């Protein structure tokens, strides 16, 4: 058996067989009072207490959230949908600990992405039992509130202050500071890692003075708060909150009255309306996300970043080669997972309209300009629109974050993931898609039984070791198997490392031309 | 009289006449519960307590261990055999303190070598009364468990977790932190020094976070954990533990059952079997040694070293000119202490087979290649095989440890001991053998009565002062008698200092060609 | 009235009129138990306690000590003799505090010189009322034991451990740490300053870990522990202690018996014998001085200095142009204060014999060599012998101390005092004598009534300000009156500053040729 005495009381885990060995899992440990009723929209409140043993033996409810129904039956999209019941009663977390119980293990705290609107920690690709087996770290993950239930903002108003999902994340990190030593974990050795919105959330914990002391280091996969989807401004947030009240017929004179009304609405009505709180929204729309609440976040993050006002520590940051493709089949004309999507100039022009709703005419023409001069290919426009979307949304904000961060003294490591999963269910033209490094990081290809190639095992093995070396030692080398040394990202040289199954290479200045466009010029339009 | 009140209770020492003066010795102070019975194989447990006075007036039991019987009657080998009764009841330590009682003396803590299989602190060449007389430091030494009784590993299993000898060492350092101030010693000024396995153990205390706070600085004579004999991997350890169970007919389904059985076996049966737990073993075999227990040692030490995860402090590291010769007369064909051992190519080839059991055919041919191109000498092959064995085993791992360590900021000093003791009982062709600087460090030649030359007195005097200056001031200069300044070992210049009776010289890049072979190339084969 | 409540109880001071203003003096505050009887030769014991008010209204007893009787009636020498009753009951100190009572004044603690054999703090040239009036610092001075009563050594023997005068000094600094805040003084802003043996004592407080925390910064006028008169080695000390026992017929089997006997002898018999405990002694002889006691001082100070083992802080160090002249009229042939002492080669040769008793023949010839090649002057040999004595004894050890100290990172300032007091009672050929900057430092020429020139007032004014700026701010600039900036003494450039009534100049490499002789070469002979 395996009871562990936490501050809140005792909890039971379950033994897992992994790679001829054992991991102990604690699935579904509550970390907050369920945010129901009076508590919906509020910050997570400290969890009651309890005698008797809590069975943390299965994954807990996933938070309310709209589901991706664009490809029913399709593993590509469906692997991302919640795989446990939705419920507002969702403030739970998971612990994988090596067997035997470690003495002082480094801890990795995963924060899932999904645009701040969706996601859950119980996804198969977020399963921590491998990292715990293989690198002997303890892996933790938590569910946090998404969509309006997690980010509805009416700032300076504790009824719905904004940022509740982040404070959920924070409360979980805290639970780790208070309880992980009982699990053989070292609260002084915690690395947050996360992907996409998850990566952005991690970068926001680097800015939140509330988070400073609740972790050691950070990893950002395909996301950073300076991405253009990451932060709703106070204006658009308030607009959106009201727009929502309107659609639920919860418009009121008084603002606490609006909240009180929104709290009698049922999750579904809120979920159903979340979509049209925005004018023209895109496949990247973040209807309810992080804002400048003057609590988690004290100023526009761009200012804090520019001015070195953040946790001084090492970071590991990275993006995938074809970041933007996943999004083009959610609205872009003549794109389809089911053919090769050779599109015309005219179609390219219309897709911009889709990704840059407004965004002026000249703005769009300037994107078309920067992106349509070439060594002349039917796939030209198709390739270009994916690259427009990844660069603007993922790659360039990540390279600029690394740059800005690194300028203040800390070591930074940058990777460019370029391996297309041999099992990817999406078609070929989509390439190395957004989110498809995660399974490498979590070490699924280490599982011989699971239809990955040998080369894939090897590559995941190495990534898994670099991630682990990073968390434990702030240095993501793989020192034993005669590997390519990963250099720090300097402003000036901007070296980054390439991850693939063949030649792993040191390279400089990723997307140089592209990012000058997006980073210098584009904000001005 | 001379009682000193320790935490555990009072203890009595004895006055020694030394060099027209007095040293106070405390020999055989218990520091742990005797590791007998239920406790065999476990970590050392905190020592009972006691009223009445413990007489620490003679050296205590030496730990169980196999004896070197290759030259009965021969002082060369026999000087190393235990010179007190063997017993599992062996967790004792010794204190030499200057008279009069010092006010705040720096402390040197000796850790003996002997391959982790043998050794004891009561050897005549480890006698601390000279250092205490001459440099007025307090010298401490402890016995720690060797062989399986000290290193039997079944990891994650407190019944035999591995590394018990190291935790013995650690517990002794602790006793020093808790008690040495009562002896006029400064717990804030402790230098660990040790030789061979002892040197490796010291280097492992540099990695063990458990040891960080229990000492100031370190000296490594002819040994470092990155030597190829120093660390048993988890695999080979477990293999060896089982192999042992098998030979004692202690194979069991359950693993605690295996330990329980091994604990009813008598030390001798365990001692007798320890040898053939290994396939083809060599004269350098370490059947039961340090492992990655995830307690004393959290990861492969090569990684921690490579990644700067160690105590930041000064080190003094060194090797002897003819490190490998001692081993060739324990199995190498046509070697003998009793003639000059001119050997043939064919004999050289066979000796490699002896030192590199397997180790591929090409591996051995590459050693023969690197080592058999010369200015053409009958002693060629004889000289070459000694040099193969010292370089691989002692010199190159020590130079690489210094290099790696020094890269993180700390001052490092490197010496190359090249004086052949005028009393060495081994023959001439063996040169400046492994272990034969110890008597210089401990200052035996300072003893006029003892058949050393004047030049030898002088050289020991100087070494003794440099060691002392190192421990007290982290700088191993001899500042008064117009000496050669010892420079720090930098990566890039790699200056080291030569110790002999004539010209003491500054030199660069010891065994440059040789170590590139062993350090870069050889691990790959 | 003016009572101040110290830890020991209340004390009364007296108002002084100074420069149209008021200083409050506390003269003769006890700081230790009187070291009489059982206590003679022991370390100073913590002072009883007391109700009622101690009148600290006049200078207290000066410590036992032989008097200079070479010029009865002569102000030159007699200004140095004790000007209060001698008594073993002499452990007293003085405080000058500005009126009105300061809020948080920097404190200067004067330690007098006199070869460790003589001196007292109540000398007119040590009067702190001016510094207190003019720079508003609090000035403290203490009497400490001199001669054998203060330095008799029998090391490791608390009956007479050596160094009692230093521990007297230390105990006084302590009294200042514990009590000066009650006097409006800042215990965190204490600068020790002292001259000659006093300067050496200051430099020894830089080495004594016991002193680390009892002061901020240091000033060394004409003295440093590395001067050849400053430290008696353990041998010569013990020799001297026994030699003394012999002359008092206190030779005994047992060593505590020797002390017990020496304690029934009356101060005079001890005082009378102190002189011939030495073979051939010189005018610079220090019969009983600092030793390596393994308490105040843990190792030969040369080693600690060479190895950076000292308090890291700023120092201000300096010497006078004609350091050695004062000594030549105490034994050197054909020298006299009463004529111009043109001496012959032969006389020069004999004076060396006087200053370098033995000291080999070649040693003396090498001094004559280095010092007798010139632009050919009858005063040649007379000038040369003064310069031999000052360089060896004062200048070169001070320049080398500054050099060595400064190499470890701290700012150092060096001055060369070159003004001959217009009132000096010694004759002209003696030039700028040893000890005759003190009156400048203490600011006597600020006193208009006192027969100094205007230029002298100005120069003292400036010195007094630089000293004050040094203590308060660690930087001895005089920033207001368009002065020459005092540069830090670097190893390499060795800039020092010249103090005189006309051109104050920056200069490099004082006595370059001379010190290489004394510093490199001479120790070898
Ligand atoms: C690619 O497919 C696009 C998507 O349209 C829908 O899916 C395809 C596969 C058909 O089943 C069609 O009935 C649906 O409208 C087409 O718009 C696009 O033109 C096709 N492009 C090609 C074949 O290159
Ligand atoms: C050196 O001796 C080797 C060791 O063999 C043994 O010891 C010698 C001294 C003899 O007593 C012999 O009976 C033993 O077998 C010999 O193998 C080797 O050939 C000898 N080499 C020489 C003389 O150069
Ligand atoms: C300088 O005086 C030296 C000291 O000797 C004594 O003092 C002098 C002034 C006389 O009063 C004499 O009776 C004493 O012996 C003489 O040794 C030295 O030769 C004199 N040198 C001169 C005049 O240049
Ligand atoms: C369901 C519940 O609340 N607690 C259960 C306990 O009753 C049960 O016996 C055990 C199974 O091993 O798992 C836990
Ligand atoms: C092993 C354990 O129980 N606690 C330790 C703690 O003492 C130490 O300060 C820290 C280093 O980061 O690792 C954890
Ligand atoms: C921001 C702007 O230009 N216009 C807004 C619009 O977005 C919104 O739908 C409406 C109701 O809130 O108020 C107005
Ligand atoms: C500006 C305004 O109308 N404020 C009111 C306030 O009186 C009250 O505290 C709150 C309670 O829900 O309702 C609203
Ligand atoms: C209710 C309201 O104010 N709606 C406006 C509407 O006129 C317009 O269609 C929309 C698009 O910008 O912005 C908003
Ligand atoms: C839903 C959608 O994408 N429809 C378009 C349609 O306009 C076009 O006819 C077709 C090519 O045949 O590509 C697709
Ligand atoms: C970190 C890493 O990639 N480690 C490797 C593993 O894949 C491989 O089996 C072997 C060397 O070939 O041991 C180790
Ligand atoms: C043997 C023992 O346990 N204690 C002895 C004590 O009896 C004895 O008198 C002393 C000799 O000086 O040494 C200790
Ligand atoms: C002499 C003694 O009793 N204790 C001292 C301690 O106060 C000091 O901090 C230390 C310096 O390393 O040396 C020891
Ligand atoms: C490691 C290897 O290749 N083979 C091992 C061998 O060493 C061992 O003797 C046997 C019993 O443990 O199991 C197998
Ligand atoms: C895996 C296994 O068989 N474990 C057992 C366990 O029930 C027990 O705690 C131990 C006591 O010695 O013996 C063994
Ligand atoms: C009991 C057992 O498995 N023994 C094997 C054996 O076949 C072989 O002689 C040895 C040498 O590699 O390795 C092991
Ligand atoms: C035990 C041993 O070393 N035996 C060898 C033997 O093969 C050889 O005959 C001899 C030279 O005569 O050298 C030796
Ligand atoms: C540290 C060292 O080697 N010290 C020497 C000693 O050997 C010698 O007797 C003398 C100088 O010649 O004093 C000192
Ligand atoms: C002499 C003595 O012990 N204490 C005296 C006190 O009696 C006296 O009245 C005062 C003069 O103002 O000075 C103090
Ligand atoms: C003025 C006073 O009463 N005390 C101060 C103290 O608070 C301060 O830390 C120090 C600075 O060196 O100066 C003194
Ligand atoms: C040091 C030396 O060479 N000889 C000494 C001498 O100084 C001294 O007068 C005598 C009595 O102590 O003992 C002898
Ligand atoms: C070595 C020697 O003779 N020591 C004695 C010692 O017994 C005693 O403690 C001391 C008391 O003054 O007198 C002396
Ligand atoms: C009592 C004694 O031993 N005296 C000697 C003596 O022979 C000599 O005059 C003196 C000078 O070196 O040194 C001492
Ligand atoms: C005590 C003294 O110094 N005496 C000398 C004396 O030898 C010499 O005659 C004189 C010059 O006349 O100088 C003086
Ligand atoms: C520090 C220093 O030398 N200060 C001077 C003082 O001598 C002079 O009277 C006046 C400027 O001429 O004010 C100030
Ligand atoms: C301060 C802590 O030290 C220990 C390490 O295991 C942690 O990573 C952390 O750096
Ligand atoms: C409630 C708001 O109504 C208006 C529209 O322009 C917006 O899209 C939003 O739906
Ligand atoms: C911090 C301590 O300071 C004192 C020294 O004697 C010790 O070596 C140690 O460095
Ligand atoms: C117990 C094991 O048996 C098999 C042999 O290959 C090994 O040497 C070992 O002795
Ligand atoms: C630390 C203290 O700070 C204040 C100053 O007045 C003192 O000189 C001292 O430096
Ligand atoms: C006591 C000693 O006696 C002998 C002399 O050589 C010394 O000068 C000393 O006086
Ligand atoms: Cl690689
Ligand atoms: Cl030398
Ligand atoms: Cl000036
Ligand atoms: Na542009
Ligand atoms: Na090679
Ligand atoms: Na010379």
Swiss-Prot record, chains A, B, C:
GO terms for biological process: acetylcholine catabolic process; choline metabolic process; cocaine metabolic process; learning; negative regulation of cell population proliferation; negative regulation of synaptic transmission; neuroblast differentiation; peptide hormone processing. Substrate binds at residues 114-115. Detected in blood plasma (at protein level). Present in most cells except erythrocytes. It is an enzyme of class 3 (hydrolase). Changing residue 140 to M: In BCHED; allele H variant. It is found in: Secreted. Changing residue 97 to M: Does not affect enzyme activity. N-glycosylated. No other PTM detected. The major N-glycan structures are of the complex diantennary type with 1 and 2 N-acetylneuraminic acid molecules (Neu5Ac) making up approximately 33% and 47% of the total N-glycans, respectively. Only low amounts of fucosylated diantennary N-glycans are detected (approximately 2%). Triantennary N-glycans with or without fucose amount to approximately 13%, whereas 5% of the total N-glycans are of the oligomannosidic or hybrid type. The keyword Transcription does not apply. GO terms for molecular function: acetylcholinesterase activity; amyloid-beta binding; catalytic activity; choline binding; cholinesterase activity; enzyme binding; hydrolase activity, acting on ester bonds; identical protein binding. One of its GO terms (cellular component) is extracellular region. Its main location: secreted. InterPro entries: AB_hydrolase_fold, AChE-related_enzymes, AChE_tetra, CarbesteraseB, Carboxylesterase_B_AS, Carboxylesterase_B_CS, Cholinesterase. Tacrine binds at residues 80, 434. Changing residue 514 to L: In BCHED; seems to cause reduced expression of the protein. Keywords: Disease variant, Disulfide bond, Glycoprotein, Hydrolase, Phosphoprotein, Secreted, Serine esterase, Sialic acid, Signal. Changing residue 241 to M: In BCHED; allele fluoride-1. It catalyses: an acylcholine + H2O = a carboxylate + choline + H(+). Disulfide bonds join 63-90, 250-261, 396-515. PANTHER family: ACETYLCHOLINESTERASE (PTHR43918), CHOLINESTERASE (PTHR43918:SF5). Belongs to the type-B carboxylesterase/lipase family. Homotetramer; disulfide-linked. Dimer of dimers. Esterase with broad substrate specificity. Contributes to the inactivation of the neurotransmitter acetylcholine. Can degrade neurotoxic organophosphate esters. This is Cholinesterase. It comes from Homo sapiens (Human).
């Amino acid at each position: 058996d395996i009871i562990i005495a936490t501050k809140n009381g005792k909890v039971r885990g379950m033994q897992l067989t992994v790679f001829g060995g054992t991991v102990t899992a604690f699935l579904g440990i509550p970390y907050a009072q369920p945010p129901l009723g009076r508590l919906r929209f509020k910050k997570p409140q400290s969890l009651t207490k309890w005698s008797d043993i809590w069975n943390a033996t299965k994954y807990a409810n996933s938070c309310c959230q709209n589901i991706d129904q664009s490809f029913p039956g399709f593993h590509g999209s469906e692997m991302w949908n919640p795989n446990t019941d939705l419920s507002e009663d969702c403030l739970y977390l998971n612990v994988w600990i090596p067997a035997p119980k470690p003495k002082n293990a480094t801890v990795l705290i995963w924060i899932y992405g999904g645009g701040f609107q969706t996601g859950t920690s119980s996804l198969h690709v977020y399963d921590g039992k491998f990292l715990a087996r293989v690198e002997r770290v303890i892996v933790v993950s938590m569910n946090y509130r998404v969509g309006a239930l997690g980010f509805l903002a009416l700032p300076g108003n504790p009824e719905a202050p904004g940022n509740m999902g982040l404070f959920d994340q924070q409360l979980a990190l805290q639970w780790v500071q208070k309880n992980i030593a009982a699990f053989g974990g070292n609260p002084k050795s915690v690395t947050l890692f996360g992907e996409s919105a998850g990566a952005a959330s991690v970068s926001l914990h680097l800015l939140s003075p509330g988070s400073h002391s609740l972790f050691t280091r950070a990893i950002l996969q395909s996301g950073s708060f300076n991405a253009p989807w990451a932060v709703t401004s106070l204006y658009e947030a308030r607009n959106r909150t009201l727009n929502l009240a309107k659609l639920t017929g919860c418009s009121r004179e008084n603002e606490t009255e609006i909240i009180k009304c929104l709290r009698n609405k049922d999750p579904q009505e809120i979920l159903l309306n979340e979509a049209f709180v925005v004018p023209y929204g895109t496949p990247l729309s973040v209807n309810f996300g992080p804002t400048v609440d003057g609590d988690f976040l004290t100023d526009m993050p761009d200012i804090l970043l520019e001015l070195g006002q953040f946790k001084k520590t090492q970071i590991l940051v990275g993006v995938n080669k074809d970041e933007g493709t996943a999004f083009l089949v959610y609205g872009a004309p003549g794109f389809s997972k089911d053919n090769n999507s050779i599109i015309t100039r005219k179609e390219f022009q219309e897709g911009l309209k889709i990704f840059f709703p407004g965004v002026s005419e000249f703005g769009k023409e300037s994107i078309l300009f920067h992106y349509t001069d070439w060594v002349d290919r039917p796939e030209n426009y198709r390739e270009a629109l994916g690259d427009v979307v990844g660069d603007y949304n993922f790659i360039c904000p990540a390279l600029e974050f690394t740059k800005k961060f690194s300028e203040w003294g800390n070591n930074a490591f940058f990777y460019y993931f370029e391996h297309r999963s041999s099992k990817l269910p999406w078609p070929e033209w989509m390439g190395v898609m957004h989110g498809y490094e995660i399974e490498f990081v979590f070490g699924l290809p280490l599982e011989r039984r699971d239809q990955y190639t040998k080369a894939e095992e090897i590559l995941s093995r190495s990534i898994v070791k670099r991630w682990a070396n990073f968390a434990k030692y702030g240095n993501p080398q793989e020192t034993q198997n005669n590997s390519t040394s990963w250099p720090v990202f300097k402003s000036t040289e901007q070296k980054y490392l390439t991850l693939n199954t063949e030649s792993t290479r040191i390279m400089t200045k990723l997307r140089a031309q592209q990012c000058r466009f997006w980073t210098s010029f584009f904000p001005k339009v």
